[PDB]
């Protein structure tokens, strides 16, 4: 099942969509700077693109640490991004009250992994009728995603994306199970599946070589999109050039059975 997000077709047999931007909104200008860069690279490579940012940092290094620009200011910034660039955007929500107002502005709203089992937040997101991205918890098996899908469905919203992030592997480590993508497709009605390679990397080319190998491996399984929380060199375009080459090949192969 494909999902239309404006002029973008997101699905598991469509050209991959890049979800990318920044961790936590800080200022208007450094936001537009970052998004202009993604847009420029994705445009020239021909890759559909959705800008990502949070307005709030939920887990902070200190009780005193910077927290982000918050909802009201956050939403202002998003509104600007859409105006300037004419692209979709995606952000996470943490509170049911937040859902409708965020959804007025943000094309896709995201269920944080830690909140994935919070029924209140599920219901309130569903009710917006917006496209929803479900961050698969590291502690949840691919087989359980169907249970989250069922709740959203029951709550009246079937416009759901499933987003791989890795799985708990002993203490403080993650592993990505490449078979999980297929399990999710098969059990969740072939909803779009996307791969958050960045957050999968708990833990040649160093880290850049790692991200590349892992991103290539996941996209080889035929996925709707790739989700980056970040990555004189042009590191982004080098990366994407290779992802696009593999994705174009994969998506040109007929599906078996």
Q: Can you give the binding site for Cl ion, defined by CB under 5 A? A: 234, 236-237
Contact 16, 243 (CB under 8 A): yes
Question: Rounded to an integer, what distance in angstroms lies between the CA atom of residue 226 and that of residue 218?
Answer: 9
Q: Please, which residues bridge with residue 50 across strands?
A: 19
Q: Residues 159 to 178: which contact Na ion by CB under 5 A? A: 168
Tokens of 121: 């937040």
Give min distance, CB of 179 to Mn ion, in A.
19
* From its own copies, Na ion, Mn ion, none, interface partner of 214 (C-beta below 5 to 8 A by class): its own copies
Tokens of 94: 């943490």
Part of the chain binding its own copies (CB under 8 A), chosen from 30-38, 42-50, 82-90, 121-129: 121-129
**CA 100, 104, 110: angle at the middle one, nearest 5?**
65
32 versus 123: smaller Cβ distance to its own copies: 123
119 touching its own copies, by CB under 8 A:
yes
Give min distance, CB of 221 to Cl ion, in A.
23
Q: Residues 4 to 23: which contact Mn ion by CB under 5 A? A: 23
- CA-derived radius of gyration, the chain: 17
Part of the chain binding its own copies (CB under 8 A), chosen from 2-10, 40-48, 77-85, 243-251: 243-251
Contact 216, 184 (CB under 8 A): no
Task: Give the position of tokens 């957050």.
Answer: 199
104-107 long-range Cβ contacts below 8 angstroms, 24+ apart:
105/75, 105/78, 105/79, 106/75, 106/78, 106/130, 107/5, 107/6, 107/50, 107/131
Give min distance, CB of 140 to its own copies, in A.
9
232 touching its own copies, by CB under 8 A:
no
110 versus 157: smaller Cβ distance to Mn ion: 110
Give min distance, CB of 115 to its own copies, in A.
6
Q: Give the rounded distance of the alpha carbon of 59 from its chain centre.
A: 19
Q: Residues 128 to 157: which contact its own copies by CB under 8 A? A: 137-139, 141-144, 151, 154-155
* From its own copies, Mn ion, Cl ion, none, interface partner of 23 (C-beta below 5 to 8 A by class): Mn ion
From candidates 106, 176, 191, 224, binder to its own copies by CB under 8 A: 176
Segment holding 3, helix H or strand E: strand 3-5
Give min distance, CB of 92 to its own copies, in A.
12
Give min distance, CB of 14 to its own copies, in A.
17
* From its own copies, Mn ion, Na ion, none, interface partner of 192 (C-beta below 5 to 8 A by class): none
Question: Rounded to an integer, what distance in angstroms lies between the CA atom of residue 130 and that of residue 14?
Answer: 21
DSSP label at 153? H
């Amino acid at each position: 099942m494909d999902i239309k997000i404006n002029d973008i077709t997101l699905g598991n047999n469509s050209p991959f969509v890049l979800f990318g931007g920044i961790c936590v909104l800080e200022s208007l200008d450094s936001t537009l700077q970052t998004c202009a860069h993604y847009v420029e690279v994705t445009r020239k490579l021909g890759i559909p693109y959705i800008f990502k940012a949070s307005f709030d940092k939920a887990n902070r290094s200190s009780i005193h640490s910077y927290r982000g620009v918050g909802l009201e200011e956050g939403l202002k910034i998003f509104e600007k991004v859409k105006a300037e660039f004419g692209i979709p955007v995606i952000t996470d929500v943490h509170e049911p009250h937040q859902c409708q107002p965020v959804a007025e502005v943000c094309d896709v709203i995201q269920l944080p992994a830690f909140l994935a089992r919070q029924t209140d937040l599920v219901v309130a997101m569903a009710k917006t009728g917006n496209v929803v991205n479900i961050k698969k918890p590291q502690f949840l098996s691919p087989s359980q995603m169907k249970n989250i899908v069922e709740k959203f469905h029951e709550a009246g919203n079937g416009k759901l994306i499933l987003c791989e992030r890795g799985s708990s592997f002993g203490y403080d480590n993650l592993v990505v199970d490449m078979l999980g993508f297929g399990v999710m497709k098969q059990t969740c009605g072939n909803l779009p599946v996307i791969f958050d390679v960045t957050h999968s990397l708990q833990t040649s080319g160093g880290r850049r070589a790692q991200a590349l190998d892992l991103a290539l491996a996941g996209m080889a399984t035929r996925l709707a999109g790739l989700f980056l929380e970040s990555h004189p060199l042009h590191l982004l375009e080098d990366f994407l050039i290779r992802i696009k080459a593999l994705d174009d090949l994969i998506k040109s192969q007929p599906i078996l059975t």
